[PDB]
């Protein structure tokens, strides 16, 4: 039912994932600074300069796409979330923790931009909570605590 609670404000997300996942990660890196040393493409970018920054938004579309297709896929996710834990831990190098300050960016996104109200806003951090325990249920099996 989390599944189908977020999905039934996803439409506005979809329409244009460019224009959300740029608002996504600029929210990001204004509120979690850190967190922008991990995209070394972007890490050292002037904030005032990222929310016209046309990469930065297709980043956050690449993102936003695959956690869309990921709600479709409402739990079953194994083939779909095994690869995104593999590449995170052993390529990218991102510390668990950062997918809860992206999931609470969205959340505060969704609400704003999608219409997503008190009971989606738990649903979606619900479903987060349920993602990222096995990104770090599998970062445990790679060897990464
Ligand atoms: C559930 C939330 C997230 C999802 C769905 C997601 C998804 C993706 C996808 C689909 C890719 C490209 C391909 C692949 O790895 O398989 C990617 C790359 C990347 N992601 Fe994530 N990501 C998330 C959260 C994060 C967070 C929290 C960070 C850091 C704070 C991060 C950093 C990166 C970086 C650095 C790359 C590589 C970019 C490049 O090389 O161009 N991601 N992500």
């Given at each position: 039912?989390?599944?189908?609670?977020?999905?039934?404000?996803?439409?506005?997300?979809?329409?244009?994932?460019?224009?959300?996942?740029?608002?996504?990660?600029?929210?990001?890196?204004?509120?979690?600074?850190?967190?922008?040393?991990?995209?070394?493409?972007?890490?050292?970018?002037?904030?005032?300069?990222?929310?016209?920054?046309?990469?930065?938004?297709?980043?956050?579309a690449t993102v936003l796409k695959k956690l869309?297709?990921?709600?479709?896929?409402?739990?079953?996710?194994?083939?779909?979330?095994?690869?995104?834990?593999?590449?995170?831990?052993?390529?990218?190098?991102?510390?668990?923790?950062?997918?809860?300050?992206?999931?609470?960016?969205?959340?505060?996104?969704?609400?704003?931009?999608?219409?997503?109200?008190?009971?989606?806003?738990?649903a979606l951090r619900n479903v987060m909570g349920?993602?990222?325990?096995?990104?770090?249920?599998?970062?445990?099996?790679?060897?990464?605590?």
């Amino acid at each position: 039912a989390d599944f189908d609670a977020v999905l039934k404000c996803w439409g506005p997300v979809e329409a244009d994932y460019t224009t959300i996942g740029g608002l996504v990660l600029t929210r990001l890196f204004k509120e979690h600074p850190e967190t922008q040393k991990l995209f070394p493409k972007f890490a050292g970018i002037a904030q005032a300069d990222i929310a016209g920054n046309a990469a930065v938004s297709a980043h956050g579309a690449t993102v936003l796409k695959k956690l869309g297709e990921l709600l479709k896929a409402k739990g079953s996710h194994a083939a779909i979330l095994k690869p995104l834990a593999n590449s995170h831990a052993t390529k990218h190098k991102i510390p668990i923790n950062n997918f809860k300050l992206i999931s609470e960016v969205l959340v505060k996104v969704m609400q704003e931009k999608a219409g997503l109200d008190a009971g989606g806003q738990t649903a979606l951090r619900n479903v987060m909570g349920i993602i990222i325990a096995d990104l770090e249920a599998n970062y445990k099996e790679l060897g990464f605590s």
